[PDB]
Amino acid sequence: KLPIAMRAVTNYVCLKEAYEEQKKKAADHPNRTPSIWLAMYRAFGRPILLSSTFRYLADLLGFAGPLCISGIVQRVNESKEFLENAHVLAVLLFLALILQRTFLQASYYVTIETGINLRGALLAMIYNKILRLSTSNLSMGEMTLGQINNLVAIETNQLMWFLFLCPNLWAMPVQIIMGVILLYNLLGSSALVGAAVIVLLAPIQYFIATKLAEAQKSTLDYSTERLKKTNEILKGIKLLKLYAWEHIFCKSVEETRMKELSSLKTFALYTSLSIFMNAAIPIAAVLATFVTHAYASGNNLKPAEAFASLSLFHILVTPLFLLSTVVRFAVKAIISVQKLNEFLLSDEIGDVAIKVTNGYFSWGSGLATLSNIDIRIPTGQLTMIVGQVGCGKSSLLLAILGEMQTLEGKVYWNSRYSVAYAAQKPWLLNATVEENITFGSSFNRQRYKAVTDACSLQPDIDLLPFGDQTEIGERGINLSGGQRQRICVARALYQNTNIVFLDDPFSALDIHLSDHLMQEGILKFLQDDKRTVVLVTHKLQYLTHADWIIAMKDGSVLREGTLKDIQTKDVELYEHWKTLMNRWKTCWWYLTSGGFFLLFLMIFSKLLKHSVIVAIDYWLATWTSEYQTFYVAGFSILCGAGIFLCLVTSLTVEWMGLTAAKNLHHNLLNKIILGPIRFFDTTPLGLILNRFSADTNIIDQHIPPTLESLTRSTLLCLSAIGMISYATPVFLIALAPLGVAFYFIQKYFRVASKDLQELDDSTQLPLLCHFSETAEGLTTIRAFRHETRFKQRMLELTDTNNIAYLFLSAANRWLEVRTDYLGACIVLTASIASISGSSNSGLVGLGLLYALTITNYLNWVVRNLADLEVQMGAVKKVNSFLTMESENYEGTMDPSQVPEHWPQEGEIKIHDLCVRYENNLKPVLKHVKAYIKPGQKVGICGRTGSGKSSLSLAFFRMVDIFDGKIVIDGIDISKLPLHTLRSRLSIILQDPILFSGSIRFNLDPECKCTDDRLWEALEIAQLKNMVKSLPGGLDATVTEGGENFSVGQRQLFCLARAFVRKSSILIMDEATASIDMATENILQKVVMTAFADRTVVTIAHRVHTILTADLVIVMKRGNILEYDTPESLLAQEDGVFASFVRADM
């Protein structure tokens, strides 16, 4: 499989020991952080020393070119002592070249091996950190799941790619210095003038690296923010599309994209300037050197010395080809490792089954949310926790589990035992249903059947494509909320632990499913195993079954004991409870996106640049062919034109890249956000967010540099071929076999590369997904204490990905070795042809040194072409989304007919409405006919899967209608533009989607509302006091996903978000699912007293709420059964509504 040295386990252990030694060294000092760079050096240095040794030997052998060219030229110009023989020197040059290529490839192999080992070790380190970091980092905005995913995907790979190129940073300097030292021998003091111009690259490149570092840090910041906004959009597309807020968030994302593109333009300008200097300081150095020699040494250059010096200049230029690449990658890797080091230095976690005494706990801030927690959980009994929204129940659970730092008090666990946690926000991995329910336990069909029948999952799973073996979660078929929650509770029940913490498992479930889970699942199945159970529920009707009762108010336990104990001590609380219960082509498109003028300007400028650059060498050959003002003047004008064209060609390609990136991302976003909701339901969010993050990163930052390096290399190779063939017209014949050979090796490479490439992208996706599903749901993994198994799985997956990437790199090295030997053969053939069949004593030299150039740059041509193919793949992925269906916003009703206040009355008539989600699917709604008067209170009830939500989303045309007319105030909604319909009606969904920013930003993203109405709304939604007490008032922050607030408070914010709009029709779809009964009653009273004029349709979670409603509808499999007042339906014998009321009460 993977050799032991290359396993992620050993590399991780080595890097971890190095980093722990660094942490010791840091503990030695105050304000001296541990450094990843020294840890990595100490751990993985010896391989890098080996590769550096190979590189130095390669450079020393590369200096054989100058000597051999000098000898060959001198001999063409004019035993065993025949080593001067031209052919002998040519053969020695060929052998030196093959040996240099062997050493270079050995160095590359060692470096890539080390880079892959280090990538594995770093991913292991940050994965263990994920398993260690406290959730208060994500809850308070310290960081986000997206940032951690960015670490795993972009930043670690950026460090790895830099480490591939690392030996250059110290090898390129040396190779340059040696060159100067040799030039000085041939040319005397004149060569010191060129040495100064070359030395100036060090200050210049350091300055440019400073500027690039600043620009890259800014780009990374704005990329983080833009991806945050994009992810929040994609996750909440339903709410945005329902509120007509799509374009507002699109505009904000575009603003952040503009800032990111300004930072990218600074980075491109300074990258384009570094390329200009690396190219034009050699032109200037050649000028200075040879002009000075012309006017200092009276003796002219003999051809041998001239060509030796020119070859030394070529050997200097080769280092500077890759200097821009290495400075770019080093500047990116420095930022990357700053981010990694910030991540790895963060906050980390610190009878009677559980006994908490005098416990003050806080959510990683400094102010206590729980105080005076004196509780005990009796062993093997049912403990129920009851409290209004935001009273510390989930806080209490995650405190016992130790997930929030303790300020005072103790918890005793008569080290922690494995506790089965069913979190309030259910978490599902990307495995099958069976894997999520078993969750790392031996399959037992008897227990599995018992659990599945206690959670009523059987009818729901047999409706799935592959019953019980269908992939679930992100990247798989998306289950409804109730299905996901019941799968999570099934997971909790199936495990063989003794303590089961269930945090409100009945939020999404209806009355029948909830009662079934309570009777068969908790009271019967768990009490048979005699397992401790802690329930956090608002279902007060279940308090009769409770064995122990904890009551929580305002963060502190108000009273604790059996029901009778509470009745005897706190008569008030018991009476309150009783009252409440009432008892390719893509490449051409990328090039053309410039506009047919940037492309042709680029290509013509590059060709002219190389024409002049090669004319410089031809001119030097002709000039030194003597053994003057005219030659100096011609040389100067050629060099100046070369510098100018270098500047132009540098700018053009980067500008092309900028424009292409901007247009690609803009089209992608403005087409994704206009798609139908069916597209987002069907397509996994991963397949879209990856386009937005990884493919966008490639398009922005990876394609322009690869393309420019490819063009430079290919034109250097073509220039060398042209010069050689001109010097020796016979070489063209020799170009027939070799060229053909090229075409073959590449061919073979492809049929493997492609294959391996697919593998390397199919084995990386699991790994990344793991880092996701552990970053999310971390508290669950640490509640079951399955951290060891997840570490093992991460090591396995990273080993697999490393095997795949190692084979990919091995194929690349195969092709590179083959092309290097082909280039050595090209050099040999050109050398022989020039020695034997060239006219002048100067053309032999040009042919030889340009053959050397061919060998030097053909390798880069091949490598960069392969990389550019793999990246045009990503451009193809991004372009694929411009063929989406676009929701029809146009509308047909003339805007003149639509009044200025269209829902002015709020009377809805639904005539023969039949709704389906996709064509050739079951009609969820069947010939429903409804008539709600203006200013009428309508309550719709039914069992899960009865089309309540379909009937709700019908008004906003998020479900495709087969037949039926929905007339709101005399207008068929089918004619209106989508926005005038979706903006003038307000709907409160069941899932509390919440965006990052202030409270204001979540209540009115347009900022078109005064603070007074925001306070009115937050008063109706019962959140006025909590916001008044919050640090920043209405400007208080809301971290991504609303994690810093309770679930109930998230829902109440979602209710205020609807109350602000103040439209005439309010569709409340199970809005009080997570709200407790105490808050829910007062909230309903206030909403009825405030919206008494408007028309509200309430799809109710409990029938008690819709008892005081003007009209009641009961749905059953898409059919309205009873249509009358609640009194009539109650008085009907054996009626459905009457049965609902008994169960709910």
Ligand SMILES: CC(C)CCC[C@@H](C)[C@H]1CC[C@H]2[C@@H]3CC=C4C[C@@H](OC(=O)CCC(=O)O)CC[C@]4(C)[C@H]3CC[C@]12C
């Ligand atoms: C000119 C000849 C003799 C050698 C060609 C390369 C070298 C000049 C070396 C010596 C100094 C090196 C540069 C000096 C330091 C930096 C900055 C470094 O990034 C940072 O320093 C962080 C940014 C910051 O300081 O805020 C990235 C590598 C780089 C460009 C180095 C790249 C390789 C350089 C140019």
Ligand SMILES: Nc1ncnc2c1ncn2[C@@H]1O[C@H](COP(=O)(O)OP(=O)(O)OP(=O)(O)O)[C@@H](O)[C@H]1O
């Ligand atoms: N992840 C979190 N990070 C920081 N503060 C939090 C977090 N969750 C809740 N809080 C704060 O803790 C207080 C208690 O909320 P908690 O999380 O215990 O809700 P809960 O009572 O379990 O929820 P509900 O009963 O509505 O389902 C709230 O004021 C909230 O501000």
Ligand SMILES: Nc1ncnc2c1ncn2[C@@H]1O[C@H](COP(=O)(O)OP(=O)(O)O)[C@@H](O)[C@H]1O
């Ligand atoms: N996103 C969806 N795409 C296709 N069909 C769905 C989707 N959601 C629900 N359904 C189907 O429509 C029917 C009614 O679902 P729904 O309207 O969600 O019921 P409820 O009113 O209880 O929410 C169900 O039988 C279900 O199979």
Ligand SMILES: CC1(C)Oc2ccc(C#N)cc2[C@@H](N2CCCC2=O)[C@@H]1O
């Ligand atoms: C004028 C010369 C000495 O200086 C430069 C400057 C920039 C670049 C580039 N890229 C290349 C070169 C030399 N060439 C031209 C073809 C191969 C090579 O090394 C030039 O012969």
Ligand SMILES: [Mg+2]
């Ligand atoms: Mg809760």
Ligand SMILES: [Mg+2]
């Ligand atoms: Mg529903």
